[PDB]
């Protein structure tokens, strides 16, 4: 079972969410942060043919990078993960499934309260502006009938009132008003086009970024407001 460049980049991105991943047989990988602030799934091309839990995903991907892209990954007779190369064989340890904080089932996202779309260029420039203006918070809200992501710097502006960035996403035809706050430290999405679904019910809330391959559910901040 080879891991292509795209699957390896996807798993490298997943390693920034959870340090280790319990990846099961099939073409589906999902991960959840240890504190449960950001969940992610992906339907990937390379078929996985054995259940294994990796306690250190970043190290596993580094070891994979050490050998060529033609390396054949399998389950060794010992039980570990045997990466076979032209002349080298590497036995990455398999973790106990209970020591890797992973979802038991893919969480079924509810019907979205507000649906919009953020393009790859817009997401890239939002991240770059975040690096530049030092904003660590965003708020997806409604302004003059359009859904806007407002980038605030929470460190100097605790009340989230001084808007440092403002990106218009698309038209909002609904009649509800909301302000879904998302920590930018929770936006661990790989660059791409994301359909942004947002769901809220009382104190419950989430924001799903549906990508072409990977979907990222992100937990809203505690001081989010809405009327859904």
């Amino acid at each position: 079972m080879k891991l292509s460049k795209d699957t390896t980049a996807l798993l490298k991105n997943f390693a920034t969410i959870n340090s280790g991943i319990m990846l099961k047989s099939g073409q589906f990988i999902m991960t959840r942060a240890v504190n449960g602030t950001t969940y992610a799934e992906a339907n990937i091309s390379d078929v996985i043919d054995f259940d294994v839990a990796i306690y250190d995903l970043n190290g596993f991907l580094g070891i994979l990078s050490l050998v060529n892209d033609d390396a054949e990954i399998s389950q060794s007779e010992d039980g570990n993960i045997k990466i076979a190369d032209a002349r080298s064989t590497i036995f990455w340890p398999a973790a106990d499934p209970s020591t890797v904080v992973a979802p038991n089932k893919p969480i079924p996202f509810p019907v979205a309260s507000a649906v919009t779309e953020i393009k790859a260029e817009d997401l890239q420039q939002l991240l770059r502006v975040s690096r530049g203006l030092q904003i660590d918070t965003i708020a997806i809200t409604v302004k003059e009938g359009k859904i806007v992501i407002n980038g605030f710097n929470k460190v100097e502006d605790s009340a989230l009132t001084r808007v440092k960035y403002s990106l218009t996403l698309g038209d909002y035809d609904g009649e509800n008003t909301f302000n879904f706050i998302i920590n930018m430290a929770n936006m661990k999405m790989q660059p791409g086009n994301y359909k942004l679904l947002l769901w809220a019910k009382g104190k419950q809330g989430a924001a799903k970024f549906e990508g072409e391959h990977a979907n990222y559910v992100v937990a809203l901040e505690a001081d989010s407001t809405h009327d859904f």
């Binding site: 602030t37 809203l220 505690a222």
Partner: protein, 319 residues
């Protein structure tokens, strides 16, 4: 009725209570925990007790189970300040998808080397106090800095009142019978279970561990009762010899109690106290304590015991 964890073979880990009702807690503590689960929102708590096994981690997890909290169990020694600045703050600032309350159980958070993280926490527990509470399990409350103890409900485990210690013991005896029945352990005598609870109290974990240890063949009997409570001998010949001031007899009997020096000397002091004027009881208390102080130092215990016997006989009074 009991909570059994299938994945655990350790007896004290297998039967870990999951609800507050299942915990063997004092009368007042259980009410202040059921009140917390009734309100539905855990305040900052600090469950602390010098004696391990009292139920701090068990109650910390059972609270988050009872209110259905978004528990993030964290090893205390792995809760360094870069962890508080990172995963813990990301946890506390965010709001759970299901709307459950967030609780950080910083278990065993009394290491001195973490005092630079606790100092970081004393504002963390105020900026994110409307969202995420903290339950700190500790063994010595002096390891939790005073500003942190001010922000939390400090609950001391393992110090029950006398009328409540006996209810703890009755509950623990009942729970040990249930554990024995679940584990296929036949109990022939309940006195051994009662004595096993008495010896290790309040260390309920060591109580279950010693229940496992004293049940190698899965049978608790009179032999186990003699083992748990020792009681190898009785004190009449030594007392009678001290009455007669028989130096040779005391010298001969000294090597007899050279094995269980602590038990013998304690029983001897207890027997002696009940048969002497109060004026001298002080004197032979001092003598016996002085003799016991150096027992781990003296090379010839027999000679140590002879010294103790003659000191007793010289400063002696039968009242």
């Amino acid at each position: 009725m009991i909570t059994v964890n299938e994945k655990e073979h350790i007896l004290e880990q297998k039967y870990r209570p999951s609800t507050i009702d299942e915990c063997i807690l004092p009368a007042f503590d259980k009410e202040t925990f059921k009140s917390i689960t009734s309100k539905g929102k855990i305040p900052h708590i600090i469950l602390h007790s010098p004696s391990p096994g009292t139920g701090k981690t068990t109650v910390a997890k059972a609270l988050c189970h009872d209110v259905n909290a978004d528990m993030m169990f964290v090893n205390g020694s792995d809760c360094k300040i870069d962890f508080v600045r990172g995963p813990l703050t990301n946890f506390a600032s965010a709001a759970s998808f299901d709307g459950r309350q967030k609780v950080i159980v910083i278990d065993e958070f009394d290491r001195s080397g973490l005092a630079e993280s606790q100092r970081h926490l004393r504002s963390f527990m105020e900026a994110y106090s409307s969202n995420c509470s903290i339950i700190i399990t500790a063994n010595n409350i002096d390891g939790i800095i005073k500003p942190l103890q001010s922000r939390c409900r400090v609950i001391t485990f393992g110090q029950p009142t006398d009328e409540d210690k006996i209810e703890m013991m009755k509950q623990m005896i009942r729970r040990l019978t249930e554990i024995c029945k679940h584990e296929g352990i036949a109990i022939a005598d309940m006195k051994v279970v009662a004595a096993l609870v008495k010896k290790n109290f309040p260390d309920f974990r060591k109580t279950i561990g010693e229940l496992d240890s004293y049940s190698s063949k899965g049978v608790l009997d009179a032999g186990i009762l003699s083992l748990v409570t020792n009681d190898r001998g009785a004190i009449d010949d030594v007392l009678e010899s001290l009455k007669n001031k028989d130096v040779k007899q005391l010298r001969a009997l000294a090597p007899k109690y050279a094995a269980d020096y602590s038990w013998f000397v304690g029983k001897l002091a207890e027997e002696i106290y009940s048969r002497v004027t109060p004026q001298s009881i002080i004197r032979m208390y001092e003598i016996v304590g002085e003799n016991n102080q150096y027992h781990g130092i003296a090379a010839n215990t027999e000679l140590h015991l002879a010294y103790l016997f003659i000191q007793l006989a010289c400063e002696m009074q039968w009242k």
